[PDB]
């Protein structure tokens with residue numbers, strides 16, 4: 001059927017529609033206008049945006065469709081390489097890293113990371129306990145400090161000490177500016193102009209800073225022989241059961257950059273969006289706070305206590321439904337095929353899955369899709385297959401899902417235990433798009449319940 005397509009700009013086709021601060025939000029508004037699928041053309045490129053569970057459940061069939069690197073992921077690949085996130089399924093290093101790393105990221109493995117996660121979580125709570133009266137909290141800034149430090153410590157036993165600085169660690173400055181450069185290049189009608197020559201030189205310098213710090217950490221761990229329980233050790237020792245080969249030090253670097261991108265961007269957004277929805281739904285906040293206080297009886301939460309924070313877990317899943325912080329993923333057709341019995345696709349045709357739109361499909365969620373009701377996640381088996389995908393699909397799904405939800409549950413748990421929150425500015429949601437989504441300018445006041453650590 002003659003697929004809907006948004007408005008065009010002559011020779012540039014649809015491309016200048018992405019010439020905005022908020023491209024994901026612009027494409028969500030196009031999906032509201034045009035429905036479950038639309039064509040998006042750019043000079044030398046065609047993509048098809050999917051919004052309905054009906055079509056996305058077919059796209060998630062691994063026999064017909066495989067992960068595609070979007071233009072965003074091709075640009076991140078200049079510094080994240082053949083790390084798990086920016087590698088094609090058919091590259092030897094994808095399956096090799098997947099087999100080696102999977103056990104390191106299982107629910108079982110989280111008992112190992114727990115103590116380290118607590119270390120950074122206690123630093124967050126102590127910062128907030130130490131604020132004077134009528135001082136406020138910058139939420140996404142503090143959550144980003146936390147998530148970044150938690151992966152640094154759990155990933156390679158490195159302390160970024162974000163809670164001791166206004167000015168972020170040099171490596172972080174280079175990563176943030178590389179990601180900015182990577183997302184900026186999407187929109188540019190004339191890639192290799194002379195304004196961009198200056199950006200190019202900055203980008204190559206930012207790639208070098210990340211490479212140098214990570215290569216030094218790998219070299220220093222090799223020389224020490226210390227067997228810390230972190231991902232770096234697992235990666236230096238570990239053999240793929242398939243090939244019987246370990247990762248070489250170049251790929252280990254790419255994995256570690258990959259992890260620090262994920263810490264920085266995704267998990268901090270989840271925690272920021274959850275706190276936002278809690279202050280805007282006080283009945284739901286009171287339910288989550290009642291659970292935190294009943295379950296988290298010890299000054300230091302244990303692994304087991306975090307596992308019994310069911311309603312905090314439902315809050316995090318409901319925040320991920322409304323604002324999935326990594327809001328899209330891309331597929332290509334392995335062979336000629338028909339999508340939904342009505343859209344023919346040629347081998348190599350791209351689909352973009354718009355996760356925020358999948359998560360608003362009224363045929364799945366009912367007619368109150370815009371309300372924050374964690375009760376939707378009361379019973380996991382009641383959610384239809386491929387209706388809820390904040391962590392992507394099949395073998396190319398987020399390897400960090402258990403790590404993210406453990407950290408977010410522990411931290412949100414401790415935040416609701418230790419503080420009452422005031423939306424003192426009546427914050428209006430403003431969603432900044434980098435690689436990910438974050439509520440920009442989200443500020444609150446925390447009143448300590450004066451419970452000891």
Ligand code: HEM
Pocket residue numbers: 067084085086098151258259262263266267270324325326328329330390391392393395396397398399400401403404
């Ligand atoms: C709330 C937090 C997170 C969300 C919403 C999220 C979401 C996602 C999504 C949607 C993908 C699939 C991307 C695609 O198909 O192109 C993915 C992949 C990935 N995520 Fe995450 N992620 C989160 C946290 C993390 C964390 C904490 C880590 C690591 C410490 C991580 C590491 C990865 C890796 C390595 C992949 C690539 C998996 C593969 O292809 O083998 N993520 N994540």
Ligand SMILES: CC(C)Cc1ccc([C@H](C)C(=O)N[C@@H](Cc2ccccc2)C(=O)O)cc1
Pocket residue numbers: 015018023024027040042045047070071072073186187326327328329352435436
């Ligand atoms: C980590 C993930 C979420 C990175 C990402 C961020 C944002 C997007 C959005 C939805 C998107 O549509 N990106 C497209 C942009 C595009 C550029 C030129 C021509 C056609 C399309 C893409 O990156 O391929 C896709 C992926």
